[PDB]
Design a protein around this ligand. Structure first.
Ligand SMILES: *Cc1c(COP(=O)(O)O)cnc(C)c1O
Ligand SMILES: *Cc1c(COP(=O)(O)O)cnc(C)c1O
Lengths: 277, 277
């Protein structure tokens, strides 16, 4: 298909990544994932705003405006005739002889974006998935959606090896987030999720879900909970652009309540549906 | 010049990295740097051993034996006619459709290696350098020499704009290591340095210096010290393959003792010098 390369759309075949691209030697870059429903991009403005925020946090200056970035994305979707799936795009500090410190400002960031056809996770959304607890060994700037993802890779692999969908991470016995999703817990009709600080990535789906809770008049409390408290929640689920609202019905052999998707998770899934294009 | 690409030596111009190389999307890989003195590789066996160990730690199976890998490096050095400088080589898990979990064991790792002529930093070895303290925000597996170097990148850049050579990192005031070097402190003829656990990379230069210390009968205590205690040291220096034994005479405007390279630091450099080709 076609790939967004810097400021132009070209056939995948024309893209050339240098061995000294800082994204390849230091994971020095940021990224975003946007879901596309039947040709329509979901919350694209919010994801673009976060790409710029992430880049700002590590001092990368994206060579062009958000408006232009949005236009390039539209083109990318049209040229690939993407129906339902997602757009992946990243920005690295650029190509320069290997050195940890920033290169001369005359070095242009490298932008890469492409699409992938991917249906909504129907089965998971209806039946829920299994998860496992994994100690959070990530760096202390999880608020940045960066390419330094080795911690997430090791966590997800451990989960997959155990036949689990996601790994629920914990730092000092406190549940932070999944390897690539935010975690929510419901207890006595109240929604709980770890607050948005450097310990987690402030997900767009996470913000949408919180808005949905307010819409159905459900109390929301952003205070963290421990692994012990998590196993005692009435309901539990994770969120991400591609997982939407996926119920977690069991963790390491221990069923969450009765092992079925709860009524509040269902109500939130219904409210979320009204938001989809 | 020529670049080592997998098991072939090709002209730099021919090397192409795929946008879905996991080293480019996750920093999913490991690397090593070997110094070359007058055409000879210094401690190459130790570096090859660590490359395989780092790789094993994140379950990447390098497809060639160490003897084969050693042969390729020798080949790479000859072809580029490298006299004095270093060899950089890394291995990533390979190219596969973007997914956090591991690809099925059929995807081969991507190996890249190249050279760079670069003289010994004689001026730094003789006059010493300035450093600055920076909170250690790195992930918890610093014992792996991986491509997830965004922490080191931000630290080094903060040091660079302060006119400093290296950033000495610390977790809750306990000194761990520099952004890309190990830190040693000397107090009353005794050598101090953080022990080798998951908080630091166990440097090969660090280990050679410790060997040098035993050879000149200088006591060594591998126990960590604080940023406050570091400032009260008689001597301080950092080590790395490219920095060798580089004295730190000043930290954040505060001289180490008198701001001059110490007697023991000189003795260690003298013993070290007997080790290089
Ligand atoms: C991207 C990401 C999420 C989810 O954010 P969304 O905008 O909802 O996709 C959650 N956790 C981590 C660690 C992430 O990187
Ligand atoms: C590579 C590295 C060092 C130094 O190790 P050497 O083998 O002596 O070069 C020190 N610290 C970090 C964080 C490193 O990655």
């Amino acid at each position: 298909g076609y790939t967004l390369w810097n400021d132009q759309i070209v056939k995948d075949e024309e893209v050339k990544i240098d061995k000294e691209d800082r994204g390849y030697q230091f994971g020095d870059g940021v990224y975003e994932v946007v879901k596309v429903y039947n040709g329509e991009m979901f919350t694209v403005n919010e994801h673009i705003d976060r790409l710029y925020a992430s880049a700002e946090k590590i001092r990368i200056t994206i060579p062009y405006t958000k408006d232009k970035f949005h236009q390039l994305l539209h083109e990318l979707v049209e040229k690939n005739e993407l129906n339902t799936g997602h757009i992946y795009f990243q920005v690295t500090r650029g190509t320069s002889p290997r050195a940890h410190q920033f290169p001369e400002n005359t070095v242009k960031p490298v932008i890469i974006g492409y699409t992938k056809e991917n249906p909504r996770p129907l089965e998971n959304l209806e039946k829920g998935v299994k998860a496992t607890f994994v100690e959070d060994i990530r760096w202390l700037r999880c608020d940045i959606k960066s390419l330094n993802l080795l911690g997430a890779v090791l966590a997800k692999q451990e989960a997959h090896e155990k036949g689990c969908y996601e790994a629920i991470l914990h730092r000092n016995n406190t549940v932070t987030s999944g390897s690539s999703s935010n975690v929510f817990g419901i207890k006595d009709g109240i929604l709980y999720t770890h607050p948005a600080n450097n310990m987690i990535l402030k997900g767009i789906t996470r913000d949408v879900v919180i808005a949905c809770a307010n819409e159905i008049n459900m109390p929301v409390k952003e205070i963290p909970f421990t692994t012990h408290e998590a196993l005692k929640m009435d309901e539990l689920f994770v969120t991400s652009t591609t997982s939407e609202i996926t119920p977690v019905i069991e963790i390491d052999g221990k069923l969450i309540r009765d092992g079925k998707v709860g009524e509040w998770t269902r109500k939130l899934q219904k409210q979320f549906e009204t938001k989809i294009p």
